[PDB]
Design a protein around this ligand. Structure first.
Ligand SMILES: [Mg+2]
Ligand SMILES: [Mg+2]
Ligand SMILES: [Mg+2]
Ligand SMILES: [Mg+2]
Ligand SMILES: [Mg+2]
Ligand SMILES: [Mg+2]
Ligand SMILES: [Mg+2]
Ligand SMILES: [Mg+2]
Ligand SMILES: [Mg+2]
Ligand SMILES: [Mg+2]
Ligand SMILES: [Mg+2]
Ligand SMILES: [Mg+2]
Ligand SMILES: [Mg+2]
Ligand SMILES: [Mg+2]
Ligand SMILES: [Mg+2]
Ligand SMILES: [Mg+2]
Ligand SMILES: [Mg+2]
Ligand SMILES: [Mg+2]
Ligand SMILES: [Mg+2]
Ligand SMILES: [Mg+2]
Ligand SMILES: [Mg+2]
Ligand SMILES: [Mg+2]
Ligand SMILES: [Mg+2]
Ligand SMILES: [Mg+2]
Ligand SMILES: [Mg+2]
Ligand SMILES: [Mg+2]
Ligand SMILES: [Mg+2]
Ligand SMILES: [Mg+2]
Ligand SMILES: [Mg+2]
Ligand SMILES: [Mg+2]
Ligand SMILES: [Mg+2]
Ligand SMILES: [Mg+2]
Ligand SMILES: [Mg+2]
Lengths: 155, 117
RNA sequence: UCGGUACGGUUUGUGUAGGAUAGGUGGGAGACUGUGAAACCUCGACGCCAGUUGGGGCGGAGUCGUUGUUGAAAUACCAC
RNA sequence: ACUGCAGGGGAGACUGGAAUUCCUGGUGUAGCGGUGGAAUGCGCAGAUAUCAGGAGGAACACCGGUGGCGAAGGCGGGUCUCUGGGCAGUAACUGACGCUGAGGAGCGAAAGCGUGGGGAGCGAACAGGAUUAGAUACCCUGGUAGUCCACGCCGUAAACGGUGGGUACUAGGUGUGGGUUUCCUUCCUUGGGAUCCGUGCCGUAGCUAACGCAUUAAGUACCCCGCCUGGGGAGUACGGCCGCAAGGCUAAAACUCAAAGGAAUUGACGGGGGCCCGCACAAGCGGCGGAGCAUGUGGAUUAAUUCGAUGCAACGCGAAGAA
RNA sequence: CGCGGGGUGGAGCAGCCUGGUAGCUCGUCGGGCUCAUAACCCGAAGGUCGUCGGUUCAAAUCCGGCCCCCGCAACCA
RNA sequence: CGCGGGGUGGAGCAGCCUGGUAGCUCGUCGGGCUCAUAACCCGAAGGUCGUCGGUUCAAAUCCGGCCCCCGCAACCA
RNA sequence: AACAUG
């Protein structure tokens, strides 16, 4: 806005898994106001995550996010008759947002049948550094680390 | 296959490019790796990041000839001029005295016409 | 001053597996210390992980492959 | 006339250092150059870079300014030689010897012309590259005349302070350039005062259509000269004069228009400036444009397809109900 | 006929002498940014390394036979 | 009249001695963008390959006939 | 870069 920053909304702790990271995942899965539907998908995929490791699922979730959080994004800027990308530093609570969007997004177009086994397989493949969500992490990094020459115009 | 302990590091820095040559105190070139030598083409050569990659590439190639300390003679109206001096330090050299040797005519030759850009 | 040629000495050699024994072939357990052993020093030689090292400086008697790989297996050591 | 004083005033000769380019040699390896972004181009046959030597040309960093000098154009590296003007003081001398000046004459930036030199860099023309609908341009890479010198021709410029010369008067304030002279003159302070000649800023009376000018007048006055008489046609034609030429000077009319102008005013606008806001962009989430149907509209058709709406701000609008 | 090299991803070319990986460049596809994939950026497809055999544990590399081009020097009555 | 080129979408050009696919550019049409038009952008459509008549299973391509267009020749008394 | 017109 013209008049400075807006207050951001607090997320209440998730009752089944006592963490605000789970309730920040259910709002990315949420479509059309189906929040009790969106929580059955997230809870159901996290129960399937411990059925393939035995480990606690939110520890697997935080290992899955740490492999897909970007550190450098590649925002665009025009100067004269040419454009380029400036590598800028991702503030941390944007990197939480931008990584939860990649896990939900790249697993909606994944090859399984239901959304529970699509979301759970993307979490397990990201907590090992294998999935397509991990692939966009280094594609975001290789794009931004190919443009260090333009890191001197940071607004 | 040489050994020269103290040398001189000449830095030319224009609005288009930067050339970082390292010589002996008699003016014999030891290594010279510039900004287009490291992979850069067009207007990316004049950026300060392209300057500090050239200053590393000439420094660590001069240390293969046993150079441990350089004197710095900079010239030219470029912004890759102080990112090069702070890249010879952070490559294993001791930079010594810094001099500006930019040529200054005493109302000498006629410059080209001004650009109606 | 830069080679070519005939011949001698010196030296070179690192997929993976794995002695670090790291070119082919031969057979080779005795060649191995006043020809003064090993440790220890480091004027150096090279570079791909540990130098295989022509450093010749220091020693006061092994610098053994049957085990446990490079087809695999020696490659200490000797002819080529 | 004498006595001083300041000065890029001018002409001639000699001469200095920096930088650019080229040449020769060394070191050196693969790029350099250029732009908004590139490409043409240069280079890999040893470029650019770098160090030493050499050749040549042109312009003179700092001083340097708002400052100085010159009738104007103009004038700044150094030294020497020849030379022009100005200011102040003394009041020694001459005794109105003054001012202006039609015609005329001389000087007169830059471009250009002739002959002869010289040519580093720059750079019309030209050539390639780019940009674009095109690009005979702007931007890039090259590049001839010319820019320099000697001697002549040209005689034009927004040659401007858009303000002809001479003279006398008419409040001051305030910087700065050159002198002269006064009280504690050293009160070191090179300070204040007076006065003469410049060159700036402000400002009174007065003037002006207004903007503005204002002791350096565009004020108040006198002398002489140049010029104007609506806008175009036109500073053109024809005639003459000058010129090697380009062209310069002198200079009309037919015809056509009822305006063309100057200053200021309010607005609107700007690919002007400052500040500021808005789902304007960004950051997000879900769409439309493709399918089938519904509804309105354009066009077409029909005997009639009733009329109205037509960029945002008409089009599931008037129509909250056409068998 | 002798000699003297060469065939490798859609095009180009290293690796070959000296045996253990098939790579680089351009073209293409896809994505990104953008007025313009002009450029710039990332990922991938595209290969019995001319074909047969042969030698070695193992051959793009080395041997031989074959097709297929390019040179040179002849031969050309 | 000789010789040798040519006729392909609305325009200008490819494709043909290499018989089995008809191509590029501008233009026309439909949609964007704009207050509107140019420029720009997306999507399409359009050709008996001059006529005829052979050859062939098959002809723009091969071979003859005509009808047009273009160029070079037409000299010695 | 960029951009004509009424
Ligand atoms: Mg003088
Ligand atoms: Mg010099
Ligand atoms: Mg020269
Ligand atoms: Mg040079
Ligand atoms: Mg002088
Ligand atoms: Mg008398
Ligand atoms: Mg007179
Ligand atoms: Mg007169
Ligand atoms: Mg004259
Ligand atoms: Mg002149
Ligand atoms: Mg001349
Ligand atoms: Mg001449
Ligand atoms: Mg041109
Ligand atoms: Mg030019
Ligand atoms: Mg001429
Ligand atoms: Mg003269
Ligand atoms: Mg003037
Ligand atoms: Mg006048
Ligand atoms: Mg007067
Ligand atoms: Mg005065
Ligand atoms: Mg005033
Ligand atoms: Mg007046
Ligand atoms: Mg008139
Ligand atoms: Mg005239
Ligand atoms: Mg006349
Ligand atoms: Mg006006
Ligand atoms: Mg405005
Ligand atoms: Mg709002
Ligand atoms: Mg947005
Ligand atoms: Mg639809
Ligand atoms: Mg109607
Ligand atoms: Mg409505
Ligand atoms: Mg259309």
């Amino acid at each position: 806005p013209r008049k400075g920053p807006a207050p951001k909304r607090p997320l209440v702790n998730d009752p089944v898994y006592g963490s605000q990271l789970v309730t920040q995942l259910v709002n990315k899965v949420l479509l059309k106001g189906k929040k009790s539907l969106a929580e059955r998908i997230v809870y159901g995929a996290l129960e399937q995550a411990r059925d393939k490791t035995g480990t606690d699922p939110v520890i697997t979730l935080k290992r899955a996010l740490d492999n897909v959080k970007p550190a450098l994004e590649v925002r665009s800027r025009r100067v004269g008759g040419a454009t380029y990308q400036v590598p800028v530093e991702v503030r941390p609570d944007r990197s939480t947002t931008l990584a939860l969007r990649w896990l939900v997004g790249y697993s909606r177009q994944r090859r399984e049948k239901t959304m529970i086994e699509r979301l759970a397989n993307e979490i397990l493949d990201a907590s090992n550094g294998l999935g397509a969500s991990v692939k966009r992490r280094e594609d975001t990094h290789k794009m931004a680390e190919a443009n260090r020459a333009f890191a001197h115009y940071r607004w | 296959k040489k050994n020269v302990p103290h040398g001189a590091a000449h830095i030319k820095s224009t609005f288009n490019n930067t050339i970082v040559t390292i010589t002996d105190p008699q003016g014999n070139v030891i290594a010279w790796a510039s900004s287009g030598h490291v992979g850069f083409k067009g207007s990316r050569k004049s950026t300060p990041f392209a300057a500090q990659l050239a200053a590393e590439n000439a420094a660590r190639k001069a240390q293969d000839h046993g150079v441990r300390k350089v004197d710095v003679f900079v010239k030219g109206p470029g912004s890759g001029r102080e990112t090069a001096i702070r890249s010879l330090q952070a490559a294993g050299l001791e930079v010594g005295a810094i001099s500006d040797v930019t040529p200054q005519p005493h109302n000498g030759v006629r410059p080209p016409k001004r650009r109606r850009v």
